[PDB]
C-alpha cells in the first residue's frame, strides 16, 4: 500500500550521458536511497514526553 511512483528529473533538451538519471523512483533523491529525512536533532530529556 505504499505509493510507488516515478518523477522526471531532467528538463527538455538536457544532454545526458550513458547511465544518467532520467527519473527518481520511490524513496530516491537524485539517484540516492532516500529512506527518510535529515532532521535537526537535540539529545536531551524533555518533561517525560
User: Could you say which of 15, 17, 30, 38 contacts other proteins (CB under 8 A)?
Assistant: 38
User: Could you say which of 7, 15, 17, 18 contacts other proteins (CB under 8 A)?
Assistant: 7
CB of 35 to other proteins, least distance (A): 5
Cα distances (angstroms) measured from residue 10 to each of 13, 14, 15, 22, 42:
9, 7, 9, 6, 37
CB 32 within 8 A of CB 25: no
User: Could you say which of 12, 15, 17, 30 contacts other proteins (CB under 8 A)?
Assistant: 12
Rule CB under 8 A: say whether 4 interacts with other proteins: no
Amino acid at each position: 500500500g505504499t505509493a510507488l511512483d516515478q518523477r522526471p528529473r531532467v528538463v527538455v533538451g538536457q544532454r545526458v550521458r550513458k547511465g544518467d538519471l532520467l527519473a527518481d523512483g520511490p524513496a530516491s533523491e537524485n539517484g540516492f536511497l532516500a529512506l527518510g529525512q535529515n532532521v535537526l536533532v537535540a539529545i536531551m530529556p524533555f518533561d517525560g514526553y
